[PDB]
């Protein structure tokens with residue numbers, strides 16, 4: 001393990017990917033959540049969600065430009081998790097815990113799911 | 124700053140992007156370095172290199188699938204930096220410092236450049 005470790009590099013990369021998303025640069029998919037639409041990078045969604053990973057790894061589904069989620073999926077809960085994917089920061093509150101946990105479970109985000117379980121234990 | 128911070132999330136994302144690159148999943152550019160070719164994600168290259176950021180932010184150059192570097196650019200030095208971009212780990216040695224520093228300077232990777240300067244000061 002002779003290589004030099006840059007402790008800030010991963011966070012710097014994520015910050016710049018979020019800036020790319022903010023500027024709509026090289027976004028290649030739209031996630032439709034009821035009346036709300038969210039543009040993103042498939043590479044990012046696959047890197048953070050078991051649901052999106054299982055969809056785009058399949059060469060048949062790889063080129064999809066639009067994804068539609070379950071109508072019982074809360075748009076604000078998806079937005080909080082889309083923000084998490086791009087920032088490492090989760091907006092967890094007692095007023096949104098159940099919607100956020102239901103959305104993370106659906107999206108197969110094991111660590112968010114684990115944190116939601118810890119939040120409840122601490123609530 | 125009420126949001127929960129996931130200290131491992133950024134590194135997890137980068138690890139999965141490197142796995143995507145390893146599996147040639149959603150790669151969209153080839154960087155030609157003399158007789159060597161390297162496939163990657165433009166979003167990743169832009170997030171790590173001033174050179175690649177300046178190229179793909181320009182809507183005229185955004186859709187380029189092939190980039191050719193200066194013939195004096197060392198393929199092993201580019202490979203070490205491409206690995207760095209995707210891992211946060213830099214393979215710096217006295218036997219490759221000058222080639223790696225010349226390549227980072229060319230690619231406009233200020234932090235790699237800074238570390239190379241610190242390595243020399245410590246060498």
Ligand SMILES: CN1C(=O)CCc2cc3cc(c21)OCCOC[C@H]1CNCCN1c1ncc(Cl)c(n1)N3
Nearest residue numbers: 046047048049050053108109110111139140142143
């Ligand atoms: C379930 N799941 C979560 O709960 C958290 C987030 C997450 C991210 C991904 C996939 C996930 C999940 O579910 C599929 C199972 O994991 C496969 C993993 C492990 N074996 C090596 C390859 N893997 C991989 N390689 C590339 C990507 Cl981009 C990736 N996983 N993405």
Ligand SMILES: CN1C(=O)CCc2cc3cc(c21)OCCOC[C@H]1CNCCN1c1ncc(Cl)c(n1)N3
Nearest residue numbers: 016017019020169170171172173176231232233234
């Ligand atoms: C020179 N340079 C380096 O030396 C290190 C790596 C690096 C990464 C990028 C661009 C770089 C560099 O050079 C252009 C100047 O920086 C622009 C920055 C700062 N103002 C906010 C927006 N910025 C930004 N936003 C998105 C991306 Cl994807 C990005 N930068 N990439």
Ligand SMILES: [Cl-]
Nearest residue numbers: 109110111112
């Ligand atoms: Cl997660």
Ligand SMILES: [Cl-]
Nearest residue numbers: 232233234235
């Ligand atoms: Cl850098």
